[PDB]
Amino acid sequence: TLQDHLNSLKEFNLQNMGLPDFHIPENLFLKSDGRVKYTLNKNSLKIE
Amino acid sequence: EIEQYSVSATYELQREDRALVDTLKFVTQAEGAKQTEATMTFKYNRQSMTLSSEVQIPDFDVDLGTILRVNDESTEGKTSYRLTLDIQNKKITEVALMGHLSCDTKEERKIKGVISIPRLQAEARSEILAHWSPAKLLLQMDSSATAYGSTVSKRVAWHYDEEKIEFEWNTGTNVDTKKMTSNFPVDLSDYP
Amino acid sequence: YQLQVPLLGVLDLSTNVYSNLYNWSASYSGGNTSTDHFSLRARYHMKA
């Protein structure tokens, strides 16, 4: 695609600021999935 | 074409059906065939506790209108309100702010904040709920916003139970390259 | 003397991170499965 960008640049006649060609992934995902769970059931141990 | 110049700050108690508006008008104008009315009027609805500010200067295309709406939904058993703010250039809301409060003193407690911008695709959401109960209090967090191909979401939920105690938190911040490119113009009117 | 001891519940934890070119998951569980029967199974697993 930079080849076509250069071909456009040959006449020094661009249409956009910069090069809209994107090397990076189309989707950029950053996520955090954390959880804390504890079973404090009321049951108990009887001791003598 | 003009007989005189007068600047006046005239107060008027205007009627809006049920409501009464303490209207104060500040106008600077020429008097005669030529009118130079540059008016800065400000109106308050003391029956709907609503404030409105108005300015007109056609020479510079000024027809700005700002409204601050407060609507009372509060009662002894429920403290509730609804806030609206209309940012209207040329009387067109290009920025709007809304809030909804619905707090049931018994169990429910709702808070909701919204930001919306139509022309810039900028939207922010801040919503909170707290369902009280003597046995336990249930908490919910909602805060999200979207603008120029960027999605922001924050979801944190906690709950207590005698059997177990449960807590979670999910963080979401995703961006799509093509979607952001389309949403954010990479082209200018006269640049090509 | 008679004493009642609340159980040491089962602890569940996991944080899973997902980013472009690198998805990572963590999962550990702790806490006695049965306080009054003395059963422990605490286990972890880290994966990148």
Side-chain angles (χ1 to χ4, degrees):
Chain A
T1 57
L2 174 62
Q3 304 325 303
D4 183 4
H5 185 78
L6 288 169
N7 302 350
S8 301
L9 180 56
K10 290 175 182 170
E11 299 184 84
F12 311 93
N13 185 2
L14 278 293
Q15 67 278 25
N16 291 122
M17 291 55 68
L19 175 48
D21 293 347
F22 312 126
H23 171 98
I24 59 180
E26 310 195 294
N27 165 60
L28 298 164
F29 59 97
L30 173 61
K31 291 208 77 204
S32 169
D33 294 328
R35 53 158 187 69
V36 177
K37 310 209 172 195
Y38 193 50
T39 63
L40 275 186
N41 308 291
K42 283 291 202 292
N43 308 109
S44 61
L45 165 60
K46 176 52 53 56
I47 301 169
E48 294 195 287
Chain B
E1 304 214 295
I2 301 164
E3 290 65 357
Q4 76 189 40
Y5 284 170
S6 181
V7 62
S8 311
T10 296
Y11 161 77
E12 296 306 334
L13 177 55
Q14 309 307 67
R15 316 304 305 214
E16 186 277 324
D17 302 336
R18 72 205 66 70
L20 292 81
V21 186
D22 282 306
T23 302
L24 170 58
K25 296 183 290 294
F26 192 55
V27 57
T28 61
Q29 76 162 104
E31 299 168 60
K34 186 63 179 68
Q35 290 305 288
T36 62
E37 295 173 292
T39 314
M40 283 73 74
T41 302
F42 313 91
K43 319 145 189 179
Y44 183 79
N45 178 344
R46 68 211 207 180
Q47 297 301 92
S48 189
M49 71 288 291
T50 292
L51 171 61
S52 189
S53 305
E54 298 75 6
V55 181
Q56 299 178 269
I57 301 171
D59 308 85
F60 269 46
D61 297 332
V62 185
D63 296 301
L64 169 63
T66 298
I67 302 93
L68 163 56
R69 287 188 184 86
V70 185
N71 304 123
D72 190 348
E73 303 183 305
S74 67
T75 71
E76 296 201 66
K78 194 204 300 288
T79 301
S80 176
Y81 296 101
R82 300 191 175 229
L83 169 63
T84 308
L85 301 94
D86 300 336
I87 298 88
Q88 300 201 348
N89 277 116
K90 279 73 68 173
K91 307 297 171 54
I92 301 301
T93 307
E94 294 158 287
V95 183
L97 316 168
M98 189 63 204
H100 290 108
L101 309 181
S102 179
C103 176
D104 297 305
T105 183
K106 56 190 287 292
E107 286 86 6
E108 293 167 292
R109 319 188 180 166
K110 306 160 57 58
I111 298 170
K112 303 208 167 204
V114 180
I115 301 166
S116 190
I117 298 171
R119 200 260 180 191
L120 310 180
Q121 196 264 330
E123 307 73 16
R125 298 291 176 159
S126 182
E127 294 69 15
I128 302 297
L129 165 63
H131 182 296
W132 165 256
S133 186
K136 63 177 73 177
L137 166 58
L138 187 61
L139 182 141
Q140 305 82 350
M141 180 176 181
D142 177 1
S143 186
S144 179
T146 49
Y148 295 143
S150 292
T151 302
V152 182
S153 175
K154 185 50 165 293
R155 317 290 174 147
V156 181
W158 171 91
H159 177 209
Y160 166 83
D161 197 36
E162 296 197 288
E163 291 69 359
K164 47 171 162 59
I165 298 90
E166 50 284 14
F167 176 51
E168 68 79 21
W169 62 103
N170 314 108
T171 313
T173 313
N174 187 355
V175 188
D176 273 310
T177 316
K178 58 185 67 169
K179 184 168 77 74
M180 183 278 288
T181 312
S182 308
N183 304 7
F184 187 54
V186 287
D187 169 51
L188 178 62
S189 176
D190 292 331
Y191 175 89
Chain C
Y1 177 69
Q2 283 55 49
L3 184 76
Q4 199 148 285
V5 181
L7 59 88
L8 302 167
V10 172
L11 168 56
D12 180 47
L13 304 155
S14 173
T15 301
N16 302 332
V17 178
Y18 303 96
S19 282
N20 298 81
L21 305 177
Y22 180 24
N23 292 350
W24 177 83
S25 172
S27 169
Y28 164 81
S29 170
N32 284 117
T33 64
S34 186
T35 299
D36 54 350
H37 295 69
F38 305 156
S39 49
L40 175 59
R41 175 232 48 66
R43 182 186 180 281
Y44 69 99
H45 162 78
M46 296 299 106
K47 168 177 179 180

